[PDB]
Amino acid sequence: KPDEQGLQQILQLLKESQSPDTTIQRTVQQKLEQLNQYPDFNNYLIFVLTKLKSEDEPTRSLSGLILKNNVKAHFQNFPNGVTDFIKSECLNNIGDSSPLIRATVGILITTIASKGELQNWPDLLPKLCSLLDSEDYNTCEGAFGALQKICEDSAEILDSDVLDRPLNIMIPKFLQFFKHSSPKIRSHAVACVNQFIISRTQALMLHIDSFIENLFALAGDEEPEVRKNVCRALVMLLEVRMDRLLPHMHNIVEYMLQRTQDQDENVALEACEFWLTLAEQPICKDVLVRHLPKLIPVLVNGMKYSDIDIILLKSDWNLRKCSAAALDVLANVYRDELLPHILPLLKELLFHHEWVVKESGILVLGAIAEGCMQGMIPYLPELIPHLIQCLSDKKALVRSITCWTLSRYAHWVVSQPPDTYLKPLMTELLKRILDSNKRVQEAACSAFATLEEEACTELVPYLAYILDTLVFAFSKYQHKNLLILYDAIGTLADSVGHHLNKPEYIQMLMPPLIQKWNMLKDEDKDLFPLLECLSSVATALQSGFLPYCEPVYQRCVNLVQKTLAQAMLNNAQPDQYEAPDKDFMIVALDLLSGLAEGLGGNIEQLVARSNILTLMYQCMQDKMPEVRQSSFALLGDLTKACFQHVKPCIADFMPILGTNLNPEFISVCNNATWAIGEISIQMGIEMQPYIPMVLHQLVEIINRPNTPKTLLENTAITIGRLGYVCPQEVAPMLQQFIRPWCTSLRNIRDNEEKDSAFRGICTMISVNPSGVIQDFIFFCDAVASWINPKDDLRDMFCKILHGFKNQVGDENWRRFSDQFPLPLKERLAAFYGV
């Protein structure tokens, strides 16, 4: 290839490339940018890097890295035999004396294989594998580094047959290098093999025995990279293959218990993982016998902040988090059986005069809370007032962890008399929300949200107090916490409901919300807590939200509109245009449904001006279930609020509702059934033409195990409603349901729903009395839940019950009535008689 004039130009350009002052390097930044699109230039780059020994390491390496960026951006462009020249030069120089040159070459190869593509370098893998065998150590190491990077980057491409089947050659090749002299090499080998465990890729699986043997042979390797890789190997293996590990299990946990205490905290982390993974397996209890008593203290010891973190404070997975996690899981496995092991530890840690210890103790308390709750109940009356005291602790990390652990005992706290625990707890938590430290602000805010979730309407007496602090936070908050503050406020709204609406409360709350609202861009993810917060505030405030509605309504529909528009654009030009992030759509639909409910009937003026339904029609057809879900919720809410604007759309909508039942998605199925139910009421007899799309499915649903409570209730309700508007189809199906219908509906509060549904079961029963006879018990018991029926409903029940009585004959009505539980048989005579 050419040289010798432009060569000097490249040399000079690279010289200026590294220069002390910004001016020169910006000028050559421009020169570089312009030249970067010409292939000949790149030929010069690889030439300088590999072939020119005259130049210093830094310069060559820089040539290589600039070339590397040139691949990174617009590699697709430059023409073949150039690219092939680069490839060849790279592969011939892979082993190189200079560590820096070797690294550059590596990143080049790596970036070419990732970018241009794996198929587009056909001979790469076989070449690297042939290089592994080399007598030159450096070539061996560079080839192995490349292979490792390649395995990490694409496992899935490698396990596919698009490459043919490379792993079939590579994996057995890798296993032969576990025995290598160089620790770097062994490290590379087991690292490469590790990518393929969870996949259960054929090559590894068929060689599994070889693998595990060589793994054991490496167990005692001094070198921490090797130990660490072995540990990873054993964790993943544990996950995928229980069988081949079983015989060696005890020795293995003996080893892991040792690695967990390892001097090098990386090895220690990778080992500690093992307990997290083992606690998921069903045989855990059996394997952990006789290692458990040591294992727990070990985990409790790893749970204090490492010294580096103690310095940094006063972000990511560390020994402490893994230990804590493993302890939580275990405490869920052993439940109350763990307490004899934990209690002594807690006794020494909790009251300790060294705050790191105390902290790790409180952490332990929190972690074991879920699994050990029952066994811990006896000790709470002593502990909780102690934690409430800790929130006042001089050290911040103590305050925060205390907030969390208390939060984990919140349920027990609200289940007790409010003045002894709940009240102090709330006062002190509120104090801590305003804490001068941000970590404590976030922890306290989260805890408090947790508490609000746990005690609802119990908060009411204290509402003003709470608001006083909450809004004040608006002034003190750095916006990282501000989001947690929104979540706190939304949770407050959800918990106290309509008690939230008073002029002073709204005047206090709204301005700062509106403030952050105005100043957030439609592109900003931080909108999510803010709108999810308003969504709940609005449902809570109801009519009192009127002043603030128009602007928020508009913004939501805009958000939904832009996201849809962007989705289609992306669909059309996916290379030129980037996909929308549908979360904005979801949050926006949420807020919308949130106004539709509690503003209901007052959105009419707004909806009448909107394309909102034209958009919803698209949302329902979206591949992403959460969108469909929010969308059907909205459909129901509008259906209630203003039906006039829906009625046009019910023709197209219904078929869509009918293909969205699909109980595999619970929330979707639910919101869709609910929606249908809301349609029928407004549609009266006009619902006639389609039952048939929905019915068979609804019956299949209400009869399905194992179906979540709410889905079943909603199903029964809408079926009842369907039978209420259109008893002619519908009702002549029963005992296909109504066992489930009744068993479900009997557990629901008395309200508009199930008033509708029961009126429907009655007008359905007039039409097909034959079906309800087989089990009439379920219906009696259902009529019996019913503390306060509407007089009409009552009378219906009377007519039906008496009808049955006279029908079946008296006395043998009573042979039937004899299996009535006391309260049932009594209420039946009391309200109806009988």
């Binding site: 952490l363 962890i401 805010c445 947690i484 807590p529 999810e532 959460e626 639910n670 919101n671």
Partner: peptide
């Protein structure tokens, strides 16, 4: 027996936790 919110869960995932 209303709509399903999924919002409280989002709030949960955003909450502070030690591990």
């Amino acid at each position: 027996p209303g709509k399903m919110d999924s919002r409280g869960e989002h709030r949960q995932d955003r909450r502070e936790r030690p591990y």
